[PDB]
Amino acid sequence: VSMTKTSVDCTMYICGDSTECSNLLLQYGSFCTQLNRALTGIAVEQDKNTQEVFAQVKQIYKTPPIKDFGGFNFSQILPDPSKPSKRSFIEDLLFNKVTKFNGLTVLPPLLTDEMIAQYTSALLAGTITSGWTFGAGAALQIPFAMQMAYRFNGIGVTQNVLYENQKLIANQFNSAIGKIQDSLSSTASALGKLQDVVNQNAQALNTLVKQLSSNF
Amino acid sequence: LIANQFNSAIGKIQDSLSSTASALGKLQDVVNQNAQALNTLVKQLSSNFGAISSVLNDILSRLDPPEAEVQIDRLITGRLQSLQTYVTQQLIRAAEIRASANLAATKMSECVLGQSKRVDFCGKGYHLMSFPQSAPHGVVFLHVTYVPAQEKNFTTAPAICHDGKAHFPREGVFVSNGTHWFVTQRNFYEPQIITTDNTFVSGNCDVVIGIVNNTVYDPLQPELDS
Amino acid sequence: RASANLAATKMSECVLGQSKRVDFCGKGYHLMSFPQSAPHGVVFLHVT
Amino acid sequence: NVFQTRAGCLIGAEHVNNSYECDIPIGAGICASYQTQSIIAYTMSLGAENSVAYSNNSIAIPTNFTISVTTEILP
Ligand SMILES: *[C@@H]1O[C@H](CO)[C@@H](O[C@@H]2O[C@H](CO)[C@@H](O[C@@H]3O[C@H](CO[C@H]4O[C@H](CO)[C@@H](O)[C@H](O)[C@@H]4O)[C@@H](O)[C@H](O)[C@@H]3O)[C@H](O)[C@H]2NC(C)=O)[C@H](O)[C@H]1NC(C)=O
Ligand SMILES: *[C@@H]1O[C@H](CO)[C@@H](O[C@@H]2O[C@H](CO)[C@@H](O[C@@H]3O[C@H](CO)[C@@H](O)[C@H](O)[C@@H]3O)[C@H](O)[C@H]2NC(C)=O)[C@H](O)[C@H]1NC(C)=O
Ligand SMILES: *[C@@H]1O[C@H](CO)[C@@H](O[C@@H]2O[C@H](CO)[C@@H](O[C@@H]3O[C@H](CO)[C@@H](O)[C@H](O)[C@@H]3O)[C@H](O)[C@H]2NC(C)=O)[C@H](O)[C@H]1NC(C)=O
Ligand SMILES: *[C@@H]1O[C@H](CO)[C@@H](O[C@@H]2O[C@H](CO)[C@@H](O)[C@H](O)[C@H]2NC(C)=O)[C@H](O)[C@H]1NC(C)=O
Ligand SMILES: *[C@@H]1O[C@H](CO)[C@@H](O[C@@H]2O[C@H](CO)[C@@H](O)[C@H](O)[C@H]2NC(C)=O)[C@H](O)[C@H]1NC(C)=O
Ligand SMILES: *[C@@H]1O[C@H](CO)[C@@H](O[C@@H]2O[C@H](CO)[C@@H](O)[C@H](O)[C@H]2NC(C)=O)[C@H](O)[C@H]1NC(C)=O
Ligand SMILES: *[C@@H]1O[C@H](CO)[C@@H](O[C@@H]2O[C@H](CO)[C@@H](O)[C@H](O)[C@H]2NC(C)=O)[C@H](O)[C@H]1NC(C)=O
């Protein structure tokens, strides 16, 4: 969704605190301002991305304490308040699997990871307790089994199939969630799409810094 | 009622656009970015890049042919890298604008010329229809959407157990206001009596988790007895 | 940015409603999805 | 009037204990705005809290509707 909001300052990077170098640099016109402007544009866009992806719910919903969802078991994905942060179990597994001073700065994101966790908790509680109706206007509660009957009716399987197979379907869903949990805990290749982003940014900065050591 | 609500909504759009100018930031930002890029490109000409003077006729008029090439080479390299920087950034920005042009064409094809079920594609709500409008270097869509308003609590039940057989709604949902059971469409409280023309039968009452007892009146029996 | 736009589309059309676009939300007939955060990205669980 | 934020030292703005929508973002959750008149810096707010009254036998059905018109602008 978003890269790292890096920024640079041309004068410090090129002519480190050197008056003679900074007087020579002025003959290249507006090269400095142009680069700073481009990097600031990227930096702002990076927060626009997160805002657009996550901030799609008007109000922060919450799940009731009495979790009786007709058989399904969401405790793996819902928030765990015992933990300091609000991150759920699978969110923690995801976070635990993803891993100078030349003018380079790393600005911080506008939405902190805790606030992002609050957004996703809102979305998850909303879908669980109100189907798809929180998407359009107000959120109208509906029993989860009836929501799933609506969903089956949505794909050409009549309602009675769900109700007559409710316990079986609940068990299959729970086991599938368990298998996702085990897959993420065991293997580490799944998160390549994010690790490639982090690696590419780190390599770009390492090349940028190593370039200061060249004679030219 | 629907006609009046639609007309009032259009009027409010007109008033909002008349009052609030910042509405078209998306287009104004593109115009500003292009003007800024050209402004910097032009301003680059007043830079020496190391030569004796940033104007080329002074170099040509002051210095001998065998010596002019050093100053002119400095100016040419500087201006050439400036022009390449401009062109590259324009190419990237044009790619972004083409992405928006393809998105706008898709919205017009799917949302104007038809009705789309893709959630939140055309405005926050169930989508009804859209109207295009031009704008300077861009397009404005007016999305007309249906938003449910006033909700009432009802007690529900997945199925109705009558005569031993379990009845499910043909299309709708069972609701009760406290003492009687009715079947309604899911998006507007319009309650109907539970008949055998609103429900279908499947199995018996021992499998469904939450079935409730009631009667499913049959339209055929009174007419057949009469 | 292109990936972020695809993620926003998926969240709107998959988390907030059922989708009939084939293979937009995982192989099979889509039922529901659940978002989860991740460092610099989002992870969807697609129930099909 | 000197606030320490996870993004730097903000001098000139009065820290408060409320939380409103963001007006001028600073970073790491903090946002600043001109209100009661001075510049304040407050933790961002994600929206009004809500808690759907879920129960296994209760449904809410609309009894009325609105027709809305929204505008979307695309370059
Ligand atoms: C669904 O919501 C609609 C609005 O979102 C409701 O429509 C409104 O219903 C009532 C009566 O139709 C009116 O709302 C108020 O009415 C009082 C008194 O009505 C008198 O004055 C109005 C305005 O001159 C006039 O139109 C009436 O005929 C009466 O002479 C007004 O004093 C209020 O200002 C307010 O308008 C509206 O007339 C009407 N709105 C529209 C746009 O027609 C509708 O009733 C709701 N549905 C249900 C089932 O409750
Ligand atoms: C839930 O909905 C039912 C269905 O409308 C309501 O039952 C109906 O209530 C009205 C008013 O109490 C009854 O009218 C009364 O009954 C007599 C004989 O039918 C009628 O001639 C009079 O006009 C009298 O006012 C109506 O009969 C009754 N329907 C049936 C089939 O008995 C019920 O009141 C609603 N409950 C709640 C809590 O809203
Ligand atoms: C919906 O209606 C049916 C039938 O009207 C209800 O089934 C009835 O359930 C009760 C309690 O489980 C049964 O009572 C039992 O009676 C036998 C003698 O017949 C007695 O030996 C037991 O100790 C018990 O008292 C009743 O027989 C049974 N009716 C039948 C089988 O025809 C059903 O409970 C109703 N739904 C709900 C939610 O109550
Ligand atoms: C819902 O799923 C949870 C997640 O596994 C289960 O509760 C766990 O059950 C196992 C087996 O006893 C133990 O790890 C703990 O008792 C529970 N986990 C934790 C972290 O406490 C169970 O399948 C379901 N729980 C409920 C309450 O229905
Ligand atoms: C819906 O939830 C309610 C509340 O938990 C359930 O009511 C319980 O029912 C069991 C057995 O029927 C009783 O032992 C409890 O004492 C009831 N609790 C309350 C608070 O009423 C109800 O059973 C659930 N619906 C279904 C179909 O099981
Ligand atoms: C809001 O402003 C500051 C927060 O920076 C509060 O100062 C501390 O607030 C915590 C929790 O509100 C208290 O436990 C501390 O005792 C406060 N510090 C002192 C020295 O008392 C301040 O109290 C808050 N005020 C209001 C009105 O919310
Ligand atoms: C349906 O009923 C429920 C409970 O009777 C309503 O939810 C409660 O509303 C009161 C205020 O009216 C709050 O004080 C409670 O906290 C609410 N309950 C919960 C669990 O949050 C609900 O408002 C009713 N639905 C409608 C449309 O009025």
The secondary structure of chain B, three-state, reads CHHHHHHHHHHHHHHHHHHCHHHHHHHHHHHHHHHHHHHHHHHHHHCCCCCCCCCHHHHHHHCCHHHHHHHHHHHHHHHHHHHHHHHHHHHHHHHHHHHHHHHHHHHHHHHHCCCCCCCCCCCCCEEEEEEEEEECCEEEEEEEEEEECCEEEEEECCCEEECCEEEEECCCEEEECCCCEEEECCCCCCCEECECCCEEEEEECCCCCCCEECCCECCHHHHHHC
Cα(B54)–Cα(A124) distance, rounded to whole angstroms? 62
Of B152, B50, C4, B190, the closest CA to residue A141 belongs to B152
A51 CA to middle of ligand 6, Å? 29
Cα(D19)–Cα(D59) distance, rounded to whole angstroms? 33
Judging by beta carbons within 10 Å of its beta carbon (0-12, 13-18, 19+), is residue B179 exposed, middle or buried?
exposed
- DSSP SS3 for A143: coil
Tell me, using a 6 A CB cutoff, whether residue A127 lines ligand 4.
no
Q: CB under 8 Å to A45, separation ≥6 — which residues?
A: C1
Yes or no, beta carbons of B120 and C12 under 8 Å apart: yes
* C and D touch per CB criterion (3+ pairs under 8 A): no
Interface residue D71 vs chain B (CB under 8 A):
yes
Yes or no, beta carbons of B155 and D58 under 8 Å apart: yes
Chain B residues with CB-CB distance to A143 below 8 A:
156, 158, 210
Q: Are A1 and A49 in contact (CB under 8 A)?
A: yes
Q: Cα distance from B134 to chain A (closest Cα, Å)?
A: 25
Residue D56 CA: which ligand 5 atom is closest?
Answer: 1
Q: Are A51 and A109 in contact (CB under 8 A)?
A: no
Residue B151 CA: which ligand 7 atom is closest?
Answer: 27
Chains with ≥3 CB–CB distances under 8 Å to B: A, C, D
Cα(C20)–Cα(D6) distance, rounded to whole angstroms? 44
Cα(C27)–Cα(B179) distance, rounded to whole angstroms? 45
CA distances from D65 to A132, B145, D60, D68 (A): 17, 10, 14, 10
Ligand 5 atom 26: the closest Cα is on which residue?
A: B210
Of B50, B60, B182, B155, the closest CA to residue A29 belongs to B50
Pairing type for strands B138-148 and D65-74 reads antiparallel
A76 CA to middle of ligand 4, Å? 9
Chain B residues with CB-CB distance to C1 below 8 A:
96
Q: Where are the alpha helices (DSSP H) in chain A?
A: 10-14, 19-25, 31-54, 89-95, 113-130, 144-153, 159-164, 166-186, 192-210
Yes or no, beta carbons of B148 and D60 under 8 Å apart: no
Q: Are A116 and A54 in contact (CB under 8 A)?
A: yes
Give the method of determination.
Answer: cryo-EM
Residue D52 CA: which ligand 7 atom is closest?
Answer: 21
* C and B touch per CB criterion (3+ pairs under 8 A): yes
Residue A89 CA: which ligand 4 atom is closest?
Answer: 20
Chain C residues with CB-CB distance to A116 below 8 A:
37
C31 CA to middle of ligand 7, Å? 29
> Can you read off the two tokens belonging to residue D3?
């606030």
Pairing type for strands D14-15 and B165-169 reads unpaired
* H or E stretch at D66: strand D65-74
Cα(B67)–Cα(A73) distance, rounded to whole angstroms? 83
Give the nearest partner residue to B43 out of A29, A140, A166, using CB atoms.
Answer: A29
For residue A200, give the amino acid letter: Q
Q: CB under 8 Å to A116, separation ≥6 — which residues?
A: A50, A54, C37
A195 CA to middle of ligand 2, Å? 66
Judging by beta carbons within 10 Å of its beta carbon (0-12, 13-18, 19+), is residue D72 exposed, middle or buried?
middle
D56 CA to middle of ligand 5, Å? 9
Judging by beta carbons within 10 Å of its beta carbon (0-12, 13-18, 19+), is residue D46 exposed, middle or buried?
buried
Cα(C33)–Cα(A77) distance, rounded to whole angstroms? 12
Torsion of Cα atoms, B209 then B215 then B216 then B221, to 10° = 150
Cα(B162)–Cα(B213) distance, rounded to whole angstroms? 6
- Per the DSSP assignment, residues forming a β-bridge with B213 are B161
Q: Are D32 and D20 in contact (CB under 8 A)?
A: no
Q: CB under 8 Å to A79, separation ≥6 — which residues?
A: A86, A87, A88, A117, A121
Cα(B94)–Cα(B90) distance, rounded to whole angstroms? 6
CA distances from B106 to B69, B75, C11 (A): 54, 47, 19
What's the half-sphere exposure (Cβ side, CA atoms, 13 Å) at A81? 3
CB atoms within 10 A of CB B202: 18
Pairing type for strands D24-27 and D30-35 reads antiparallel
What residue of B is the nearest CA neighbor of D66? B147
Interface residue B121 vs chain C (CB under 8 A):
yes
Yes or no, beta carbons of C12 and B99 under 8 Å apart: no
Residues in the ligand 3 pocket, defined by CB under 6 Å: B 161, 213
Interface residue B92 vs chain C (CB under 8 A):
no
> Can you read off the two tokens belonging to residue B44?
């680059």
Angle B46-B47-B52 (CA atoms, 0-180°, nearest 5)?
Answer: 110
Ligand nearest to the CA of A181: 4
DSSP per residue, A46-81:
HHHHHHHHH---SSB----SS---TT---TTTS--T
Tell me, using a 6 A CB cutoff, whether residue B225 lines ligand 7.
no
